[PDB]
Amino acid sequence: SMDIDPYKEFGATVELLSFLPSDFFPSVRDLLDTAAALYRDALESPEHCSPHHTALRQAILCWGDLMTLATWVGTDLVVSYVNTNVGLKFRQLLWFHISCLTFGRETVLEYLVSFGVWIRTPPAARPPNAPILSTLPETTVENLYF
Amino acid sequence: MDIDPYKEFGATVELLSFLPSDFFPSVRDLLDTAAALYRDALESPEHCSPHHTALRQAILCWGDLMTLATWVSRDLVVSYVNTNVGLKFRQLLWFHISCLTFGRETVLEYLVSFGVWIRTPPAARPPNAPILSTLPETTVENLYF
Amino acid sequence: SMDIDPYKEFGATVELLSFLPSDFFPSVRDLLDTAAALYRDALESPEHCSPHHTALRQAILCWGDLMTLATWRDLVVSYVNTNVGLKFRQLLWFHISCLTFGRETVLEYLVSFGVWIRTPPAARPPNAPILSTLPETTVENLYF
Amino acid sequence: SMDIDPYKEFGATVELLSFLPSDFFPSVRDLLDTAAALYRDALESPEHCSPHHTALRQAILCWGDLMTLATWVNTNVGLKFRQLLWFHISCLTFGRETVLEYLVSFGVWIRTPPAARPPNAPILSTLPETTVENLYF
Amino acid sequence: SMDIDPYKEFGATVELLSFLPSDFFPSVRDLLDTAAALYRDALESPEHCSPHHTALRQAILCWGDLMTLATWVGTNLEDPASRDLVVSYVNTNVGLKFRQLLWFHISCLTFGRETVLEYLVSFGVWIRTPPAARPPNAPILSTLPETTVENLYF
Amino acid sequence: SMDIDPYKEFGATVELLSFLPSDFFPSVRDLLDTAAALYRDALESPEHCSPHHTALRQAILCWGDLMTLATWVGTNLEDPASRDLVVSYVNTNVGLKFRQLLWFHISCLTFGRETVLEYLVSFGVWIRTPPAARPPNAPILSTLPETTVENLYF
Ligand SMILES: COC(=O)c1c(CN2CCOCC2)nc(-c2nccs2)nc1-c1ccc(F)cc1Br
Ligand SMILES: COC(=O)c1c(CN2CCOCC2)nc(-c2nccs2)nc1-c1ccc(F)cc1Br
Ligand SMILES: COC(=O)c1c(CN2CCOCC2)nc(-c2nccs2)nc1-c1ccc(F)cc1Br
Ligand SMILES: COC(=O)c1c(CN2CCOCC2)nc(-c2nccs2)nc1-c1ccc(F)cc1Br
Ligand SMILES: COC(=O)c1c(CN2CCOCC2)nc(-c2nccs2)nc1-c1ccc(F)cc1Br
Ligand SMILES: COC(=O)c1c(CN2CCOCC2)nc(-c2nccs2)nc1-c1ccc(F)cc1Br
Question: Which positions form S-S bridges (chain C)?
Answer without folding.
Answer: none
